[PDB]
């Protein structure tokens, strides 16, 4: 690796690369940063904490014209793997986390191609706020979001956009979360129905605010209610319906009110069971609670 | 050369489908620029160097559930005078495993750990298994699971777009059998007793 060592020395030592400055010719220019999200696996959705835990891989693409070289002059080298701390980065963070972990988990190497394109695919474990609608529990569906933006840079400095596919005769933006059919396997309790992606821009917010721009990836997920059905609803419903037998019990048995009050006690035990599984929110009474 | 030593099977989480294990990830490779002649240095044939000071493979657990993706414990490497480096960092792997609960508590699971260089393809960095099986010589006994079988396989994938760029991984799989005595004693026997008591009302 005489050639890679020489190329790195040329790019960074000789030309005096400064990672603190953005890759622009003038300060008034903005850096285009394209983002895509791959959902490796949906770890969980905790209802009481109202928290979604996901494993995601964030594909970043941008251009750094200071990292350009003519490959023939450097042994036909076309791509370099570099530590991310050597180059300028677009400081994309998860805005709507609820644990203080704003950043990606593993800071993997950047791939720098000879034409100045920087490709970076860090993976991350994120814990995000997802308010829960308990109205139709356990037959409920939820709507979670992952809002990515920059706090160190505003819309004046970087322009966020979705990944643009350009392999065909018409380009198009990737407006969905990427799910690899070979590397993905569904969560045991949640099935993904929709998975859109959007670039949100606040017209009222000023350009020099971090809240002007964001890219949001949404997950509409449906609960698979088999567990709750089998282990709660059928026993509870059957035990509740069992109370109607008292009208067919003769009064001489001396066991009517005992049966009825015991059914009430069983329902109380079921209510104790269910109280530990949902948040104590006031938007609605859960269907099982109803 | 990549080898996996399984020290302990810490826990199997059937709800979130996560296997947490304690492992040692032995990695061996030659560094061309880190050679010397021992005669010129008093017969020193090996030294210990911080792992942060040298290039390393960027091995990542591809099927990580919610733990660390790569090595975070940067222990020292053993460097020989021939440039050979052995680095055996510890790790706690939290890996996704599709749990089939059909036969629970008499179920058998097949949990895998897929490892690969995240940013290097097979044309720049090649990984090979150290052995056909994970090293279980220092495995602590589990009170909940019995590992019936273990085996490491190397896989190479070439995409039709890029025929000269293979992407490599090594997958270590463990076929494990649950020990059902706890569930037999605590769950099945009381349920059987209630089932038996159900019929006594008719006498």
């Amino acid at each position, epitope marked *: 690796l005489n050639e890679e060592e020489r190329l790195i020395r040329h790019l960074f030592q000789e030309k005096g690369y400064n990672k603190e400055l953005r890759p*622009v*010719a*003038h300060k*008034e*220019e903005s850096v285009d940063v394209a983002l895509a999200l*791959t959902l490796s696996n949906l770890i969980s959705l905790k209802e009481v904490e109202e928290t979604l835990t996901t494993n995601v891989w964030i*594909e970043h*693409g941008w*251009t750094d*014209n200071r990292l350009k070289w003519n490959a023939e002059e450097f042994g036909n080298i076309s791509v370099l793997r570099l530590p991310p701390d050597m180059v300028w980065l677009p400081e994309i963070v998860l805005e709507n986390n609820n644990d203080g972990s704003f950043q990606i988990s593993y800071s993997c190497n950047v*791939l720098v*191609y000879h*034409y*100045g*394109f920087v*490709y970076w*695919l860090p993976p991350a474990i994120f814990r995000s706020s997802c308010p829960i609608s308990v109205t139709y529990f356990p037959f409920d569906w939820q709507n979670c979001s992952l809002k990515f933006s920059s706090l160190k840079y505003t819309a004046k400095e970087i322009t966020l956009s979705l*990944k*643009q*596919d*350009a*392999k*065909e*005769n*018409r*380009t198009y933006p990737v407006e969905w979360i*990427i799910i*690899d059919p070979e590397g993905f396997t569904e969560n045991g309790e949640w099935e993904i129905v929709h998975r859109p992606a959007r670039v949100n821009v606040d017209p009222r917010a000023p350009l020099d605010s971090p809240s002007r721009q964001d890219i949001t990836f949404y997950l509409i997920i449906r609960r698979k209610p088999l567990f709750y059905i089998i282990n709660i609803l059928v026993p509870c419903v059957l035990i509740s319906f069992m109370v109607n037998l008292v009208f067919y019990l003769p009064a001489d048995s001396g066991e009517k009110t005992s049966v009825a009050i015991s059914v009430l006690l069983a329902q109380s035990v079921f209510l104790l069971l269910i109280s530990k599984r949902l948040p104590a929110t006031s938007m609605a009474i859960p269907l099982i609670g109803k | 050369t990549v080898g996996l030593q399984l020290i302990q099977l810490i826990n199997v989480d059937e709800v979130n489908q996560i296997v947490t294990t304690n492992v040692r990830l032995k990695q061996q490779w030659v560094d061309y620029n880190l050679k010397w002649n021992p005669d010129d240095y008093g017969g020193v044939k090996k030294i210990h160097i911080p792992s942060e000071k040298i290039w390393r493979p960027d091995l990542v657990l591809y099927n990580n559930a919610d733990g660390d993706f790569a090595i975070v414990k940067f222990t020292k490497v053993l460097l020989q005078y021939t440039g050979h480096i052995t680095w055996t960092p510890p790790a706690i792997f939290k890996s996704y495993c599709e749990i089939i609960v059909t036969h629970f508590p008499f179920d058998e699971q097949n949990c895998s750990m897929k490892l690969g260089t995240w940013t290097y*393809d097979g044309s720049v960095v090649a990984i090979n298994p150290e052995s056909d099986q994970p090293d279980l010589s220092n495995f602590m006994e589990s009170g909940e699971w019995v590992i019936k079988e273990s085996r490491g396989w190397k896989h190479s994938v070439t*995409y039709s*777009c*890029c025929p000269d*760029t293979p*992407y490599l991984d090594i997958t270590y799989h463990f076929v494990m059998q649950r020990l059902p005595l706890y569930f037999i004693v605590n769950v099945i026997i009381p349920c059987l007793l209630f089932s038996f008591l159900t019929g006594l009302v008719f006498y």
Partner: antibody, heavy 133, light 110 residues
Framework: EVQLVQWGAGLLKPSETLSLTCTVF????????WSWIRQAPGKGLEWIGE???????NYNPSLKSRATISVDTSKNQFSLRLSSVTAADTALYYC???????????????????????????WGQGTLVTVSS | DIVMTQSPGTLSLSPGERATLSCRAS???????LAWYQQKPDQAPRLLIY???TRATGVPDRFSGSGSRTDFTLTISRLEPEDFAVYHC??????????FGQGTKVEIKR
């Protein structure tokens, strides 16, 4: 050494369709964008449109409705068709090589993009087009 | 979308003199993405400068590009007989459509 050779009928009548073809030697169409540029006598250069090897086109807004650019990779050629020509379309037409086009990634992350270097270093010899009745 | 205007129009200068050609953009040229071309009679345009300062291959040291933002300059230090041609500026920094200037002819002065 990339060379561009143009051909096509330069003498046309009003309301007809000009058709020009540019063939590339010493290189493939895969690596670049390829553009058509017209120069009227006593006027500046005007960019008509561009195409890449996948057939993705961009057009000048003033000529988009009448200009169609196509590519044929088997013969390493790209062609321009200008419909309903008038005397205002009399000009010297050039083909030229534009910005570099690159592929990156593997599997589902395989993608392509163009470099921000759309200057025209290699040009065709030029074809004089005259539209007269 | 971006209009390019070349100011001198015609430059009558003697051999051995210094020529200065100006190009003005109606909008900021991102990244200093400006190219200068030379066109002799009965010939296609030849790329002289790109990125507003970088000489193309085979271009003598007499040609030099400079400027930024919306004001760009091509300077010929010493004029030779072969340098009397039509010079064009072009912008490529802000997506298509790609636009040229109207051209500036450099004539010989007698």
């Amino acid at each position: 050494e990339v060379q561009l050779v143009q051909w096509g009928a330069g003498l046309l009548k009003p309301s007809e369709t000009l058709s020009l073809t540019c063939t590339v030697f010493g290189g493939s169409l895969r690596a670049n964008y390829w553009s058509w540029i017209r120069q009227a006598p006593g006027k500046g250069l005007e960019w008509i449109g561009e195409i890449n090897h996948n057939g993705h086109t961009n057009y000048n807004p003033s000529l988009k409705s009448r200009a169609t650019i196509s590519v044929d990779t088997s013969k390493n050629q790209f062609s321009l068709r200008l419909s309903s020509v008038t005397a205002a379309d009399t000009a010297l037409y050039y083909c030229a090589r534009g910005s570099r086009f690159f592929y990156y990634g593997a599997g589902i992350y395989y993608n392509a993009r163009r470099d921000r270097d759309n200057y025209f270093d290699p040009w065709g010899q030029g074809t004089l087009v005259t539209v007269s009745s | 979308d971006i209009v390019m205007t070349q100011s001198p129009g015609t430059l009558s200068l003697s051999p051995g003199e210094r020529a200065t050609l100006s190009c003005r953009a109606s909008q900021h040229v991102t990244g200093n993405c400006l190219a200068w071309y030379q066109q002799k009679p009965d010939q296609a345009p030849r790329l002289l400068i790109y990125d507003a300062s970088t000489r193309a291959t085979g271009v003598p040291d007499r040609f030099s590009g400079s400027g930024s933002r919306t004001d760009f300059t091509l300077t010929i230090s010493r004029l030779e007989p072969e340098d009397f041609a039509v010079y064009h500026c072009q912008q490529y920094g802000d997506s298509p459509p790609w636009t040229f200037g109207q051209g500036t002819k450099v004539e010989i002065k007698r």
